[PDB]
Design an enzyme around this catalytic site. Structure first.
Site, mmCIF file in Angstrom:
data_model
loop_
_atom_site.group_PDB
_atom_site.id
_atom_site.type_symbol
_atom_site.label_atom_id
_atom_site.label_comp_id
_atom_site.label_asym_id
_atom_site.label_seq_id
_atom_site.Cartn_x
_atom_site.Cartn_y
_atom_site.Cartn_z
ATOM 1 N N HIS A 40 46.748 44.904 -38.831
ATOM 2 C CA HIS A 40 46.222 44.592 -37.494
ATOM 3 C C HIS A 40 46.500 43.142 -37.066
ATOM 4 C CE1 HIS A 40 42.436 42.928 -39.403
ATOM 5 N NE2 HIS A 40 42.370 42.267 -38.275
ATOM 6 N N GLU A 52 47.726 24.329 -45.959
ATOM 7 C CA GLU A 52 46.772 23.846 -44.965
ATOM 8 C C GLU A 52 45.317 23.640 -45.391
ATOM 9 O OE1 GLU A 52 47.330 22.477 -42.013
ATOM 10 O OE2 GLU A 52 48.732 23.724 -40.944
ATOM 11 N N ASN A 54 42.936 21.179 -42.886
ATOM 12 C CA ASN A 54 42.737 21.078 -41.463
ATOM 13 C C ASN A 54 43.955 21.618 -40.697
ATOM 14 O OD1 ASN A 54 40.862 18.970 -39.545
ATOM 15 N ND2 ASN A 54 42.388 20.065 -38.630
ATOM 16 N N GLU A 62 51.428 20.369 -46.025
ATOM 17 C CA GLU A 62 51.920 21.554 -45.338
ATOM 18 C C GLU A 62 53.401 21.924 -45.490
ATOM 19 O OE1 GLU A 62 50.417 18.826 -43.808
ATOM 20 O OE2 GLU A 62 48.775 19.557 -42.597
ATOM 21 N N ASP A 84 45.286 49.064 -43.763
ATOM 22 C CA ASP A 84 45.467 47.811 -43.051
ATOM 23 C C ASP A 84 46.029 46.680 -43.941
ATOM 24 O OD1 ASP A 84 45.174 45.830 -41.006
ATOM 25 O OD2 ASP A 84 43.108 45.649 -41.238
ATOM 26 N N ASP A 171 29.121 36.383 -44.477
ATOM 27 C CA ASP A 171 30.187 37.364 -44.212
ATOM 28 C C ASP A 171 31.505 36.740 -43.757
ATOM 29 O OD1 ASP A 171 31.211 40.094 -43.781
ATOM 30 O OD2 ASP A 171 29.871 40.492 -42.196
ATOM 31 N N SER A 177 40.547 37.537 -40.580
ATOM 32 C CA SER A 177 41.458 38.701 -40.728
ATOM 33 C C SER A 177 42.756 38.469 -41.465
ATOM 34 C CB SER A 177 41.902 39.280 -39.389
ATOM 35 O OG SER A 177 40.845 40.015 -38.807
ATOM 36 N N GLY A 178 43.128 39.337 -42.390
ATOM 37 C CA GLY A 178 44.357 39.155 -43.160
ATOM 38 C C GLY A 178 44.210 38.281 -44.401
HETATM 39 N N1 LIG Z 1 31.170 42.316 -40.740
HETATM 40 C C1 LIG Z 1 32.515 42.286 -41.283
HETATM 41 C C2 LIG Z 1 33.246 40.969 -41.184
HETATM 42 C C3 LIG Z 1 34.345 40.956 -40.151
HETATM 43 C C4 LIG Z 1 34.058 41.210 -38.814
HETATM 44 C C5 LIG Z 1 35.070 41.161 -37.867
HETATM 45 C C6 LIG Z 1 36.373 40.862 -38.258
HETATM 46 C C7 LIG Z 1 36.657 40.615 -39.595
HETATM 47 C C8 LIG Z 1 35.641 40.663 -40.541
HETATM 48 CA CA LIG Z 2 47.119 20.570 -41.557
#
Ligand SMILES: [NH3+]CCc1ccccc1
Ligand SMILES: [Ca+2]
Length: 223
Positions: A40, A52, A54, A62, A84, A171, A177-178
């Site tokens: 995704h 990386e 900052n 980098e 995914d 969380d 993501s990824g």
């Molecule tokens: N509650 C799950 C954590 C989460 C939420 C949205 C995108 C990636 C990870």
């Molecule tokens: Ca940097």
């Protein structure tokens, strides 16, 4: 990452930032020329940013390498988020050192109860927004498949696991993501999805990398 801590510069050396003029997804370096991320996160014109901390400041460690090919899992379903996972090949090989290093693929699936490190530059608030510029870290356990299926009735496949806390507050979140879920020095998960962030009985859901190890190896052997 919500409810985490600042990792410290280059303490997560396999962590990559995918950039298309801005950070949009994390990823993991699995060897000097290949990165694994979430399908995704697929985009054309990806530059991979290694070393990386900052992401808005050039600090000296980098390596910015453009992607030459991206391969989304052949059975990726964007509606269910099943499978995914995607691979990104770099135009040239990364220069590997203490601060830029690949992460090992698993030979075993990690069990529920295993503590893991989740990291990224995503949102740090469960309600509203604040994006860090430096890498954030979170230690979280892999949850049992039955509490995962009870949190997300009818949505968990065998290519997913839940990790985190059933009572919320901690969380991964948007922009993470990824990114990697590393358990005992092996890449076990990819930040994939969830219902909001850090909410009660809505833990993060992660792509289960141990199911994909021979597709990964076959694919890098041939591309
Ligand atoms: N509650 C799950 C954590 C989460 C939420 C949205 C995108 C990636 C990870
Ligand atoms: Ca940097």
């Amino acid at each position: 990452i919500v409810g985490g801590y600042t990792c410290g510069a280059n303490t997560v050396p396999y962590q990559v930032s995918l950039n298309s003029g801005y950070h949009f997804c994390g990823g993991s370096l699995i060897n000097s020329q290949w990165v694994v991320s979430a399908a995704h996160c697929y985009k054309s014109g990806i530059q991979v940013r290694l070393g990386e901390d900052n992401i808005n400041v050039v600090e000296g460690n980098e390596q910015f390498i453009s992607a030459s090919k991206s391969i989304v899992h052949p059975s990726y379903n964007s509606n269910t988020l099943n499978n995914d996972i995607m691979l990104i090949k770099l135009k040239s090989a990364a220069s590997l050192n203490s601060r830029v290093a690949s992460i090992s693929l698993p030979t075993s699936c990690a069990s529920a109860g295993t503590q893991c490190l989740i990291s990224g530059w995503g949102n740090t608030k469960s309600s509203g927004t604040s994006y860090p510029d430096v890498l954030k870290c979170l230690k979280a356990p892999i949850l049992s498949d039955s509490s995962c299926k009870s949190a997300y009735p009818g949505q968990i496949t065998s290519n997913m696991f839940c990790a985190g806390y059933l009572e919320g507050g901690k969380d991964s979140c948007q922009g993470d993501s990824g990114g990697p879920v590393v358990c005992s020095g092996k890449l076990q998960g990819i930040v994939s999805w969830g219902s909001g962030c850090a909410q009660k009985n809505k833990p993060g859901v992660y792509t289960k990398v141990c199911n994909y190890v021979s597709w990964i190896k076959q694919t890098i052997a041939s591309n």
